[PDB]
Enzyme design. Sequence first.
Site, PDB file in Angstrom:
ATOM      1  N   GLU A  35      58.219  72.056  28.092  1.00 49.74           N
ATOM      2  CA  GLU A  35      57.565  72.308  29.354  1.00 49.74           C
ATOM      3  C   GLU A  35      58.157  71.563  30.542  1.00 49.74           C
ATOM      4  O   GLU A  35      58.214  72.150  31.614  1.00 49.74           O
ATOM      5  CB  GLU A  35      56.081  71.877  29.291  1.00 49.74           C
ATOM      6  CG  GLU A  35      55.188  72.849  28.500  1.00 49.74           C
ATOM      7  CD  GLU A  35      55.070  74.218  29.093  1.00 49.74           C
ATOM      8  OE1 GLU A  35      55.618  74.622  30.102  1.00 49.74           O
ATOM      9  OE2 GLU A  35      54.521  75.014  28.276  1.00 49.74           O
ATOM     10  N   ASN A  46      53.777  80.443  39.936  1.00 48.85           N
ATOM     11  CA  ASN A  46      53.642  81.777  39.395  1.00 48.85           C
ATOM     12  C   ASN A  46      53.156  82.750  40.439  1.00 48.85           C
ATOM     13  O   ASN A  46      51.949  82.876  40.728  1.00 48.85           O
ATOM     14  CB  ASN A  46      52.669  81.802  38.213  1.00 48.85           C
ATOM     15  CG  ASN A  46      52.950  80.608  37.343  1.00 48.85           C
ATOM     16  OD1 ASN A  46      53.945  80.654  36.595  1.00 48.85           O
ATOM     17  ND2 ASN A  46      52.153  79.543  37.522  1.00 48.85           N
ATOM     18  N   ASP A  49      50.020  85.381  40.089  1.00 53.15           N
ATOM     19  CA  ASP A  49      48.626  85.052  40.376  1.00 53.15           C
ATOM     20  C   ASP A  49      48.535  83.922  41.364  1.00 53.15           C
ATOM     21  O   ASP A  49      47.515  83.371  41.668  1.00 53.15           O
ATOM     22  CB  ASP A  49      47.893  84.745  39.039  1.00 53.15           C
ATOM     23  CG  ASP A  49      48.254  83.402  38.428  1.00 53.15           C
ATOM     24  OD1 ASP A  49      49.180  82.715  38.776  1.00 53.15           O
ATOM     25  OD2 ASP A  49      47.388  82.938  37.563  1.00 53.15           O
ATOM     26  N   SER A  51      49.369  80.856  41.003  1.00 52.65           N
ATOM     27  CA  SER A  51      48.986  79.553  40.533  1.00 52.65           C
ATOM     28  C   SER A  51      50.291  78.786  40.439  1.00 52.65           C
ATOM     29  O   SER A  51      51.397  79.397  40.625  1.00 52.65           O
ATOM     30  CB  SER A  51      48.310  79.643  39.191  1.00 52.65           C
ATOM     31  OG  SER A  51      49.110  80.340  38.224  1.00 52.65           O
ATOM     32  N   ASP A  53      51.983  75.487  37.957  1.00 54.70           N
ATOM     33  CA  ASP A  53      51.909  74.607  36.801  1.00 54.70           C
ATOM     34  C   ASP A  53      52.436  73.283  37.207  1.00 54.70           C
ATOM     35  O   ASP A  53      53.468  73.153  37.842  1.00 54.70           O
ATOM     36  CB  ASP A  53      52.691  75.072  35.585  1.00 54.70           C
ATOM     37  CG  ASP A  53      52.168  76.407  35.293  1.00 54.70           C
ATOM     38  OD1 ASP A  53      50.976  76.672  35.221  1.00 54.70           O
ATOM     39  OD2 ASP A  53      53.152  77.249  35.145  1.00 54.70           O
ATOM     40  N   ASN A  60      48.162  74.355  34.505  1.00 54.94           N
ATOM     41  CA  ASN A  60      47.937  75.371  35.504  1.00 54.94           C
ATOM     42  C   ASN A  60      46.724  75.199  36.445  1.00 54.94           C
ATOM     43  O   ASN A  60      45.641  74.816  36.034  1.00 54.94           O
ATOM     44  CB  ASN A  60      47.850  76.705  34.789  1.00 54.94           C
ATOM     45  CG  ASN A  60      47.759  77.909  35.743  1.00 54.94           C
ATOM     46  OD1 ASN A  60      46.690  78.514  35.980  1.00 54.94           O
ATOM     47  ND2 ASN A  60      48.918  78.308  36.235  1.00 54.94           N
TER      48      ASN A  60
END
Length: 130
Positions: A35, A46, A49, A51, A53, A60
Amino acid sequence: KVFERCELARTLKRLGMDGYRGISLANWMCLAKWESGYNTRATNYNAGDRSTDYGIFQINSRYWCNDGKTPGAVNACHLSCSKLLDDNIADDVACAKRVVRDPQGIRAWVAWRNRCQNRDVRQYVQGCGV
Ligand SMILES: [Ca+2]
């Protein structure tokens, strides 16, 4: 900060992560490695949507932490996402612990399923005395 492998390993152990909800420490290390490369400042946006991370675990903003700019945001960890961008990982750990409290467990993170689940992860902790 970018942690070194064994250092991350001991800190996570200290923080109670070894075997939390049956997830071993090597599994959490594998997750952080894929990650963020062990970088507390990693981020990922992202567009789909809107959002983002955040941090070592790529938590998120739509479900977990609040960043004030993600619609539908639910803030389950009751934590501002910006706290996941600093060098102290205790809050990241508390939030990741909450995430795995839901039914999917660690399968919530697709990277873990693709790069960790069912594979040998002992390399992550070898030599750390953990
Ligand atoms: Ca933090």
